[PDB]
């Protein structure tokens, strides 16, 4: 089968001073 | 193929707007079948309707 799967995600708002 | 996948597209010498899509607008040549992917059966009917 195919495995070149693009799966977009963004980091969680866990970077705030 | 593009023609056979839509039963409402009718290859007819009067449906010129559909026929123009299979003719090069710059050179006037009829695209060969691999260009558009139409099967040999529909490409012959397109070539006859265009002529």
């Amino acid at each position: 089968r195919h495995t070149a799967f693009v799966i977009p995600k963004k980091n969680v708002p866990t970077s705030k001073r | 193929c593009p023609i056979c996948r839509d039963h409402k597209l009718h290859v007819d010498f009067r449906n010129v707007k559909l026929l123009e899509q299979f003719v090069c607008a710059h050179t006037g040549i009829i695209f060969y079948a691999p260009y558009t992917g139409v099967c040999v059966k529909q490409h012959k009917r397109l070539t006859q309707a265009i002529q």
Binding site: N11, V12, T14, S15 | -
Partner: protein
């Protein structure tokens, strides 16, 4: 390397509470105890019985308020009274909290033969101390 009760460093996206963020060597230094009774004082008895009861109450409340507890329980004993202080979330309707409070207090009073009370403090979300 030591492991006991240590939330290990990650990519900076793991929220941890104040209690979870402190290893065992900080007990009595930066964090208090989650249960207070006289069983472990010098010359006092029944430490074994108080311990079993505490372990059960923590499992009982975890499964009785599923997905609601936002922190560990605080168990307090004075005389023969048993106070259970829990920090819960604001997702369940108030009616269900009142049902579960009346249900759990009554069931535990008959189980351990003592007046039991449950004090709930609600929070909009799990209080985050740091992101490991």
């Amino acid at each position: 390397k030591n492991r006991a009760a240590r939330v290990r460093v990650s990519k900076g996206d793991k929220p941890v509470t104040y209690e979870e963020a402190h290893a065992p060597h900080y007990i009595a230094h930066r964090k208090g105890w989650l249960s207070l009774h006289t069983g472990n004082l010098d010359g006092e008895d029944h430490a074994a019985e108080r311990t079993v009861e505490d372990v059960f109450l923590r499992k009982f409340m975890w499964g009785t308020f599923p997905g609601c507890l936002a922190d560990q329980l605080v168990l307090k004993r004075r005389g023969n009274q048993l106070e259970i202080c829990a920090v819960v979330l604001r997702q369940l309707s108030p009616h269900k909290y009142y049902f579960l409070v009346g249900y759990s207090e009554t069931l535990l009073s008959y189980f351990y033969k003592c007046p039991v009370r449950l004090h709930l403090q609600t929070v909009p979300s799990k209080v985050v101390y740091k992101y490991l």
